[PDB]
Amino acid sequence: AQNPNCNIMIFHPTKEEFNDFDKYIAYMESQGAHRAGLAKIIPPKEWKARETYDNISEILIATPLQQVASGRAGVFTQYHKKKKAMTVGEYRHLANSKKYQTPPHQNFEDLERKYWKNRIYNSPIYGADISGSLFDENTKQWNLGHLGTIQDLLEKECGVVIEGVNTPYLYFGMWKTTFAWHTEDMDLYSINYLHLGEPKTWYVVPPEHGQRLERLARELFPGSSRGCGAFLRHKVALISPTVLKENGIPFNRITQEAGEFMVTFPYGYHAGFNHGFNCAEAINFATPRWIDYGKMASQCSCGEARVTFSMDAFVRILQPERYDLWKRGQD
Ligand SMILES: O=C(O)CNC(=O)C(=O)O
Ligand SMILES: [Mg+2]
Ligand code: NI
Ligand SMILES: [Zn+2]
């Protein structure tokens, strides 16, 4: 078995290997990458996502989210308070202000220490989940707005034609902005490209060990667990690496820099934070190997998780027994 310790693998495809996206995902899996839950892909030196980032400041962040924490430093939840709209240029200035800017630090490890020590005492503002793309239309390789759609994959594998579309999302981050422990909707893959700015640190649990994380989460968030049998679908809970180590939960960590891709694999729990002002783009995708994960994915039916239009068909076709309860949660 390849990669039996479930380490995060880093890949350096050549320009020729960068042509066929599906084939390269399948290559990475042949080497065991999926066992970690997360892989890094460094594009060939010949590649670029677009010519410059000099003209992005007029993009609108219609609903910036202030991420307010409750709990203790290593075990907390966050809620998202909606703020007034602002442009990317306005947001960048805010991120660079004395109130929100990254503190002086020695290296990534020192900054990680400061994050876990101090995150709860601040409420950074995240421009998340903004439909759109920063890839040039002429970029033909690993262009996250030109991938094969998950609807087409389901149709190719299973023969059923379904409604729905699949488009990318932009994320504008600042110091301490946080993504809570989650897997993707319907335990899909994700791909994330860091277009510009400061790094993003990731933490990930191997898919084969995801239920260990879930069991710890039910212990650590006992009221939430009683409210919903899939409350990590709410995307609000954080658990530090120190706490994970104290409870014997297998995980790995890595820092993504500008110009790098990350791929999350089906049922790979992940969480993380941004180091400073940055912009990422991400999208869900599927492969043939996903179908069995989609069929077994947990679902939130309590009403909190509320998701896209396009998840309806996935639940309806892959999980018909769960469909009626899940849809009641949607309504
Ligand atoms: O970058 C973020 O804030 C969160 N991204 C993801 O969870 C992802 O790409 O799957
Ligand atoms: Mg602009
Ligand atoms: Ni994700
Ligand atoms: Zn729920």
3-state SS, 284-322, equals EECCCCHHHHHHHCCCCCCCCCCCCCCHHHHHHHHCHHH
List CB-based neighbours of ion ligand 3 within 5 Å.
190
| C-alpha 269 to ligand 4 mean position (Å) | 17
Residue nearest to atom 2 of ligand 1 (CA): 179
* Atom from ligand 1 closest to the CA of residue 179: 3
Residue 234 assigned to a binding site: yes
Residue 286: closest CA among 245, 317, 257, 259: 317
125: left (phi over 0), alpha (psi -120 to 50) or beta: beta
Residue 270 assigned to a binding site: yes
- Measured at the CA of 312, the angle between CA 308 and CA 313, to 5 degrees, comes to 125
Query: Which amino acid is it at 227?
Result: G
Residue 329: closest CA among 307, 302, 310, 308: 302
Residue 200: closest CA among 282, 105, 80, 108: 108
- Are the beta carbons of 157 and 288 closer than 8 angstroms? yes
| Distance from C-alpha of 141 to C-alpha of 156, rounded to nearest angstrom | 22
* Atom from ligand 1 closest to the CA of residue 192: 9
Query: Which amino acid is it at 148?
Result: G
Could you tell which of 147, 174, 192 is best to mutate to test the pocket of ligand 1, judged by most ligand atoms within 8 Å of the CB? 192
| Distance from C-alpha of 288 to C-alpha of 26, rounded to nearest angstrom | 10
Query: Which amino acid is it at 80?
Result: H
Token pair in block for residue 126: 């995240």
Residue 203: closest CA among 8, 9, 3, 2: 8
End-to-end alpha carbon distance in the chain: 44
Determination technique used:
X-ray
DSSP category for residue 141? S
Residue 182 assigned to a binding site: yes
Q: Which ligand is nearest to the CA of 233?
A: 4
* Atom from ligand 1 closest to the CA of residue 128: 3
- Measured at the CA of 165, the angle between CA 160 and CA 166, to 5 degrees, comes to 110
| Cβ neighbourhood burial of 259 (10 Å; 0-12, 13-18, 19+) | middle
| Distance from C-alpha of 188 to C-alpha of 297, rounded to nearest angstrom | 9
| C-alpha 181 to ligand 3 mean position (Å) | 8
Domains of the chain (ranges; CATH) run 1-331 (2.60.120.650)
| C-alpha 152 to ligand 3 mean position (Å) | 21
Q: Which ligand is nearest to the CA of 191?
A: 1
| C-alpha 299 to ligand 4 mean position (Å) | 8
- Are the beta carbons of 231 and 237 closer than 8 angstroms? yes
Residue nearest to atom 4 of ligand 1 (CA): 179
